[PDB]
Design an enzyme around this catalytic site. Structure first.
Site, mmCIF file in Angstrom:
data_model
loop_
_atom_site.group_PDB
_atom_site.id
_atom_site.type_symbol
_atom_site.label_atom_id
_atom_site.label_comp_id
_atom_site.label_asym_id
_atom_site.label_seq_id
_atom_site.Cartn_x
_atom_site.Cartn_y
_atom_site.Cartn_z
ATOM 1 N N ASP A 7 55.051 35.698 36.354
ATOM 2 C CA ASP A 7 56.303 36.300 36.846
ATOM 3 C C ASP A 7 57.384 35.264 37.223
ATOM 4 O OD1 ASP A 7 54.736 38.604 36.435
ATOM 5 O OD2 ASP A 7 55.231 39.511 38.402
ATOM 6 N N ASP A 51 42.613 39.447 45.303
ATOM 7 C CA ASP A 51 43.969 39.712 44.730
ATOM 8 C C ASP A 51 44.564 40.786 45.653
ATOM 9 O OD1 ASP A 51 46.197 39.559 43.096
ATOM 10 O OD2 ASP A 51 45.102 39.963 41.235
ATOM 11 N N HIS A 61 54.126 48.045 37.198
ATOM 12 C CA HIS A 61 55.123 47.548 36.249
ATOM 13 C C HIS A 61 56.227 48.555 35.867
ATOM 14 C CE1 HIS A 61 52.210 44.367 36.188
ATOM 15 N NE2 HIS A 61 52.878 43.635 35.296
ATOM 16 N N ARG A 117 46.427 44.947 28.073
ATOM 17 C CA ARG A 117 45.906 44.335 29.293
ATOM 18 C C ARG A 117 44.612 44.940 29.836
ATOM 19 N NH1 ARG A 117 49.713 41.946 34.118
ATOM 20 N NH2 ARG A 117 48.064 42.501 35.598
ATOM 21 N N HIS A 162 52.399 31.381 38.117
ATOM 22 C CA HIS A 162 52.303 32.811 37.837
ATOM 23 C C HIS A 162 53.275 33.123 36.722
ATOM 24 C CE1 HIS A 162 52.258 37.136 38.378
ATOM 25 N NE2 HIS A 162 51.261 37.022 39.264
ATOM 26 N N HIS A 178 47.258 37.601 48.694
ATOM 27 C CA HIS A 178 48.699 37.775 48.693
ATOM 28 C C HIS A 178 48.998 38.090 50.157
ATOM 29 C CE1 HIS A 178 49.636 38.338 44.375
ATOM 30 N NE2 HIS A 178 48.305 38.366 44.342
ATOM 31 N N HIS A 189 41.578 35.903 38.081
ATOM 32 C CA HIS A 189 41.262 37.095 37.268
ATOM 33 C C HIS A 189 41.054 36.748 35.779
ATOM 34 C CE1 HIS A 189 45.573 36.821 36.873
ATOM 35 N NE2 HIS A 189 45.769 37.165 38.146
ATOM 36 N N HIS A 242 47.811 32.148 36.769
ATOM 37 C CA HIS A 242 47.909 33.511 36.220
ATOM 38 C C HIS A 242 48.763 33.230 34.972
ATOM 39 C CE1 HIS A 242 49.284 37.961 36.575
ATOM 40 N NE2 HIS A 242 49.765 37.503 35.418
ATOM 41 N N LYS A 283 50.528 27.797 42.973
ATOM 42 C CA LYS A 283 50.182 28.892 42.065
ATOM 43 C C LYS A 283 51.207 28.925 40.932
ATOM 44 C CE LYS A 283 48.697 33.012 40.608
ATOM 45 N NZ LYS A 283 48.853 34.160 41.566
ATOM 46 N N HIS A 306 42.226 34.347 46.657
ATOM 47 C CA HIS A 306 43.309 35.020 45.939
ATOM 48 C C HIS A 306 43.955 36.006 46.900
ATOM 49 C CE1 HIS A 306 44.883 36.538 41.811
ATOM 50 N NE2 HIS A 306 45.802 36.748 42.756
#
Ligand code: NI
Ligand code: NI
Ligand code: NI
Ligand code: NI
Ligand code: NI
Ligand code: NI
Lengths: 566, 101, 100, 566, 566, 100
Positions: free
Chosen positions: E220, E359, E319, E335, E218, E135, E271, E245, E216, E133
């Protein structure tokens, strides 16, 4: 018209008869000759000499040098001379008088539009140092050595593994291939040593064919007469050098037995005094032999009041001895001996020991080969006075004797003196520029193959390059493809013939070693003495023709606390 | 003096001008919260949201771009929708359209 | 902080001057790098305070005397140069013959 | 439905009519236009617009951009506009409205599965800076310039050698070849300048054929009429630029004699005010000429209360003058003049000086070209008020006039405006993203050829990228083969035709310079003024049509102590 | 003759029945087996075993290993065994007894002239960690992970851009090509993930053909049923993995709807507890499914007294929520849930969660995957006592269960277990050597493909490698062409068939992924539990067969303040 | 010490905070990087002492006031974030609107 000698020296650097102190030592060099024509010196700058139609001519690039070091005070084994140095195609072109033949007399180094200038007035210029006892424990050692003025590193290893922590051996074709590939990334010329300890000659021939320029025989892999004989037989067939760390334990025989196994063949003996390893207590007797090229490693150079205390404990930690075991204590005391450590400095002064080296991160300091060589020269001048060879009120011969220990003599020992080791026409332009106050400690510029590779550099955002902080930073000669063009990887003749450079896609320029077998003690520049040396088995006293060889330990040294932050 | 400060011209900005709009009453019949973004094809939201799906065909929420509307379990809202523009082709979401409309 | 390479380079200089400051406080005679670091950091702090370039070119000469440095150090340092951010931007300060 | 303008600006960045302060200066920009459709802005994140079937479409990679900078406030010579910027194949694809044509109106930048997003809402985006007075003293200057927002560096040199410390010259084919090879390692676009000072044109043609995109004439190599004439004759044959540092000493003639030698041919005059070098005291008069492209170097920008004191001493140290020699003092005072240093700021404000540059580590600061350009704009707004060209209650025209000085005007001068220098379709995507509070001082992201090359980065082991310490670190656009794909090495037409890139095995993308000879003062974007300028020989007063041109020195500047740790 | 077990353990490391504490935890491992012949152990050094004709034989390079790790205490999913490890051609050759068959019995790892030695007596040796994971926010993450004992990194990104800050996606052929080129520069094995969120399968096939080994999905980019279905259809055609995700917002459906879209196809859920993202509050229920390979990211591992406070605020900052908006607060609270964070630790202990990951810099710590895995094992032993599978007075089964989470299970999930993930014959020699006091925190040596890549290293200029300061420095295995030989870039089968490595001129060794589609929960080594798990919609309580799954937060942890300077 | 890159990176932060601490002690108004370094280092020392994340999120707001920093600095710093090794491992501390 006339100019005073003091005003001349301030403007162009010293000339014939002027003397210069080396850093903060008691050593003084005297300018022996000056290749200039007075009034015709070339200086670069606003309204100066090196300008179109003046000191710079109209010639094409093929007809002028790529680089000129102006007004350099050259210090090399062959002389202490004032001259301009011309560099062309990354090699030394000439040592003489630079300028424009259209308007100036006696020009031997033509300057044209294609010429870059390095101002060496008031600086000392030397060849790049050659360290032949490198343990490749980590790649950071390359920049550390380069900053100290060392441009060639010969050694062995694979990184921080037990084998390499103890020995300068790159074992086997796979690791030899990987280390030759990694060498392209480092801004120093490199040659590798293989593991020489085997009694099957084909296991040695495979390593030479993979690329090694020499084989190291180390007691930790078994420095027996059979292993030494096998490595020397292969070395004689393949034109490579053999380096030796002999049997300290006297397990297979005493020093005479190792000498019998060598059988008059050429061999480089590492740390010949023996604190770094070798037949206890008498490996030092090897310097009497015509076929032996003896080196010292640097922690014992020079003998100081802290030497024995640091070494007895340094050895105890390396070998995991513990001061409670009488036999481990008896071993430590058999290896660390005040008598041989003190004799070693005198043997260097007499030219009986021919090379200096580090033994990097394995009982040796990679950035101190040069500094310690000069500390020994200083201590010997203080204790012994002038050498028998000395002419004039100067230390020129002692300086030539010592500079040869880290330049030409390691190059001759390892068969690379056709490429590096001295400031001589046709050799690679590996040059070090020193301010006299920092000679041997902190260089002004380090040049690799005609490009500056490392130099002190001030604030990058400053209006000039001199504001603080000034620290050593890699230059263009150390970047990617320019670095590849400006460094050499040395290979054996077998590896070059087998197309190893093409197979591994090595990017750097390649040089091939030759003449490792024909080199003898008599060939060591200014360091050819073969003394009738003995070591007493009970007292460890070193004698030459019955005369005790000893020295006194230094309390304080030059090239030390005045210069270093820590 | 505030570095990089804005001096915004006071007023209002009218969003999605000239576009067809409609209003639908929506209720979250699920037991978990649902939040819907400004550009999601409203007719293809979580099936636990109960409303007139036929009226919502080809529409998205009429809210500032990048913002969302949250429906807590049992929450009821009347939302304003705005028609999709461009080629008016819907691909993705719950795979209910996958072409023009 | 968005530190640029030039700001990180000056942190090295500040650290070297901390080493020198502690050694001078123990009564040691300073060596070449300690002396250069100590005077250079002094100038950088003067610029941060808003002193003028002209004022610091003179103040820099009264940081260390010959009795506070090792033999030969004053001759090894004919000048000290450092740039710093003054209220009116980066400027070069050169201190001539700083140790007498 | 409606949203307040304050709430809109907080969510998407400012729109038409909103104003933004540039860093801590008194300069305010006003958004002139916005290419979006209100309600259809693209934002990336959880539950946001750029998602499958929404703001992201179903198109193949050939049919969408590789990268979108969303909601950018573009500041360039051509406008101050709010728009999305699309990048495809490392080049600017479009400036307009991004999204999905399947559901959104007016989309000109299609977003698909193949599209990466950079969130530029609330940020200012500019072209990468172009510095054309680089001395290649050390390779560390590249990262220093890149961090400051400079993506292209034109200059000359070979490392920290006397020639390069004084001049931007890479002398001869051998050094030109080595520096082109070293350039592959640096994350900036590079073009080299050769040594232009020779009276034999073939020695110049060889350097151009080796790869140089221009020739530097410097007084330290002899800036005589014959050398200038020779370099310009070659430049006219080979489509390369000539850069000039004229004869400060007036040895061969006065400024009128150099202008006669130039004979109306195109030339870039470095440090035109003259503190950095040139005919004393009147080189500044060159900005009256249509064939001259005049630049300033940055230490004199803007005029401050510490300027004269720093410069008089900075020059005295560079040239080794000593304040005791009346003639050395007379020389220093002839070069450093309050009258020309103060006039220079006004001449930039009027558009009579067209470019800004560094003169890196040779009387110039490599990381301050951009910062100092804006400090001059601020000081001129404070002293002079609005420009005659200004429309509205903003500083938009002054901002466009000044940004052109370090972007498009250097690119046009050096024949590379077809590749770099502005945010325009088909140009390389060299972009700088700035937070308005840090505009011109510390960028948020620096993009080279479509990849992020450097950016502030917090703790590597942190759970997010923002925790301290935050400092500039090289990104993927600065690594090995990705860097090679994302940077350009500029070559002359002769070098490209002769296959220099293939011969030297250059790994980076190649661009060829063109249009160096046809560029004139009238082509300098927003900076085409040709004033009737004079300098009094006795007082040094600068006058334009008899009117005194002067300014007052700053006590405190913006973009200074608020931002920097030292 | 006899030696005491305490003296044996001091000389050769522990043997059968001896126990070792893992760092400062309460975990104890017991040696299960020893492959040596007592009296015939190989040790390297002065007067030791590995010497010519003794422990070192006369064989040619083809007949002996390139490297031997002597007396290693192996800790792997398959056992806790004492053995020598042989490496040949950068791969694991054998696990057994090293030596010379000429004089020693039972030799399975022949040592010859071509063999390098790593002394592993008293050390623990493990496979290199595999983090899936990642990034790719910055390239500095590679050295940070390698120092922590992670040798393979799978993830996505293009640098510090909005898309990558949020998601592990390398979007499109252009960025995939640039990142594969940049990967050659990093000393870790790398595989890339593409952007899986699209409903047009050809936009996904283009990314796989460009080089990605997975896709992936996701939220988003829109984690809708149609996007998930499209990515899984392509993954089944192209033998690549899908990472998920899920839709936290429940916008397109609830967790049951995402599971219906998956339709029993293989997928790696990132996750899985859900604090890092996923259907609120019940994404954790995915671990009941046979086709789901569930991982945890590390900030929630283990549950501590500072967890909730750090996370609630960490999420609020990511966020841009602001604690004043009731709906943003309602989102944050949906969350971050103490109930699932506490259950996650128990689910790892039971083998219901199979992998751990970072992550990296997106709600995860790149250098803490290993450290946190062991902190969970410690906390679970403290709270739960012995596992049901445990035999003996030791923690061997718990240790095997947890080490599988960062080694073999990530390798199986991503189709690379044929190359990496365990100490097994024929696999790449990616090995980590640990001193037991620093196990899981600070390794002694990190080996990549048979070469040491990074290691702690003391003063470069010191006489030995141990003097201070000791810090992690890259070794020869991390340099240029040696690094290329010693690392792997993983490609899809389509990219390898299309000649992507040749087109992009990738220099590293290439490996191709296979078996991503056939892997299931039952294949997760020691972590195959499929519990009947439920989450209460109102209370968030996690139950397995109606039984509450919970744990207590730690106040203090091992592997923390005792080791780290900050 | 076996320092990892993350530990060496925090040494840079500690050094930048030493520069700021000495300037604040001379009565200077701190700039942007000085202010960020000073507050961040304060949090790291609080974590080393065993303070909670919640406690440090509040304590971090009382290190510097508007009168101790240059104009515009509070607006340039909407939050300060730093991770440190607490007794229970690495944790992220975010200090919101630290300077008022
Ligand atoms: Ni030895
Ligand atoms: Ni050695
Ligand atoms: Ni100039
Ligand atoms: Ni210049
Ligand atoms: Ni996620
Ligand atoms: Ni993630």
């Amino acid at each position: 018209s006339n100019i005073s000698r003091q005003a001349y020296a301030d403007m162009f650097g010293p000339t014939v008869g002027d003397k210069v102190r080396l850093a903060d030592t008691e050593l003084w060099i005297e300018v022996e000759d000056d290749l200039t024509t007075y009034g015709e010196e070339v200086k670069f700058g606003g309204g100066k000499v090196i300008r179109d139609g003046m000191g710079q001519g109209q010639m094409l690039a093929a007809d002028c040098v790529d680089l000129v070091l102006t007004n350099a005070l050259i210090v090399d084994h062959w002389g202490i001379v004032k001259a301009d140095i011309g560099v062309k195609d990354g090699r030394i072109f000439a040592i003489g008088k630079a300028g424009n033949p259209d308007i100036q007399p006696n020009v031997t180094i033509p300057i044209g539009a294609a010429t870059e200038v390095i101002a060496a007035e008031g600086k000392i210029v030397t060849a790049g140092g050659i360290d032949t006892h490198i343990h490749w424990i980590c790649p950071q050692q390359a920049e550390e050595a380069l900053v100290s003025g060392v441009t060639t590193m010969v050694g062995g290893g694979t990184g921080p593994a037990a084998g390499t922590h103890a020995t300068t051996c790159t074992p086997g074709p796979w690791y030899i291939s990987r280390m030759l590939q990694a060498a392209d990334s480092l801004p120093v010329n490199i040659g590798l040593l293989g593991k020489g300890n085997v009694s099957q000659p084909d296991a040695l021939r495979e390593q030479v064919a993979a690329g090694v320029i020499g084989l190291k025989i180390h007691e930790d892999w078994g420095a027996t007469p059979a292993a030494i004989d096998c490595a020397l037989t292969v070395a004689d067939e393949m034109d490579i050098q053999v380096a030796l760390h002999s049997d300290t334990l006297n397990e297979s025989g005493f020093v005479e037995d190792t000498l019998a196994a060598i059988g008059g063949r050429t061999i480089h003996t590492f740390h010949t005094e023996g604190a770094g390893g070798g037949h206890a207590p008498d490996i030092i007797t090897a310097c009497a032999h015509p076929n032996i090229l003896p080196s010292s490693t640097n922690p014992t150079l020079p003998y100081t009041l802290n030497t024995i205390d640091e070494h007895l404990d340094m050895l105890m930690v390396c070998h995991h001895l513990d001061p409670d075991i009488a036999e481990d204590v008896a071993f430590a005391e058999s290896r660390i001996r005040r008598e041989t450590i003190a004799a070693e400095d005198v043997l260097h002064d007499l030219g009986a020991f021919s090379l200096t080296s580090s033994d990097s991160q394995a009982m040796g300091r990679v950035g101190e080969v040069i500094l310690r060589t000069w500390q020994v020269a200083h201590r010997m001048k203080v204790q012994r006075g002038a050498l028998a060879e000395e002419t004039g009120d100067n230390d020129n011969f002692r300086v030539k004797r010592y500079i040869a220990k880290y330049t030409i003599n390691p190059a001759l020992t390892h068969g690379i003196a056709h490429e590096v080791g001295s400031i001589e026409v046709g050799k690679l332009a590996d040059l070090v520029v020193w301010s006299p106050a920092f000679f041997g400690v902190k260089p002004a510029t380090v040049i690799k193959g005609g490009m500056i590779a490392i130099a002190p550099m001030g604030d990058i955002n400053a209006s000039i390059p001199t504001p603080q902080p000034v620290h050593y930073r890699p230059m263009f000669g150390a970047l990617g493809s320019a670095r590849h063009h400006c460094r050499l990887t040395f290979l054996s003749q077998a590896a070059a013939a087998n197309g190893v450079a093409e197979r591994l896609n090595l990017r750097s320029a390649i040089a091939v070693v030759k003449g490792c077998r024909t080199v003898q003690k008599a060939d060591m520049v200014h360091n050819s003495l073969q003394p009738n040396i003995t070591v007493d088995a009970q007292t460890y006293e070193v004698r030459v023709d019955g005369e005790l060889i000893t020295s006194e330990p230094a309390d304080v040294l030059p090239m030390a606390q005045r210069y270093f932050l820590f | 003096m505030i570095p990089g400060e804005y001096h915004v011209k006071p007023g209002q900005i009218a969003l999605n001008t000239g576009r067809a709009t409609c209003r639908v009453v929506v209720e979250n019949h699920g037991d978990r919260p649902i939040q819907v973004g400004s550009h999601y094809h409203f007719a293809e939201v979580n099936p636990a949201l109960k409303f007139d799906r036929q009226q919502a065909a080809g529409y998205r929420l009429n809210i500032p771009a990048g913002t969302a509307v949250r429906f807590e379990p049992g929450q009821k809202r009347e939302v304003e929708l705005v028609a999709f523009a461009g080629h008016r082709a819907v691909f993705g979401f719950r795979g209910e359209v996958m072409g023009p409309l | 902080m968005e530190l640029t390479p030039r700001e990180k380079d000056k942190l090295l200089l500040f650290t070297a001057a901390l080493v020198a400051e502690r050694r001078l406080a123990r009564g040691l005679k300073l060596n070449y790098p300690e002396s250069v670091a100590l005077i250079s950091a002094f100038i950088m702090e003067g610029a941060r305070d808003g002193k003028s370039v002209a004022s610091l070119m003179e103040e820099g000469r009264h940081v260390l005397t010959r009795e506070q440095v090792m033999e030969g150090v004053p001759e090894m340092i004919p000048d000290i140069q450092v740039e710093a951010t003054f209220p009116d931007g980066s400027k070069l300060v050169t201190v001539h013959n700083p140790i007498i």
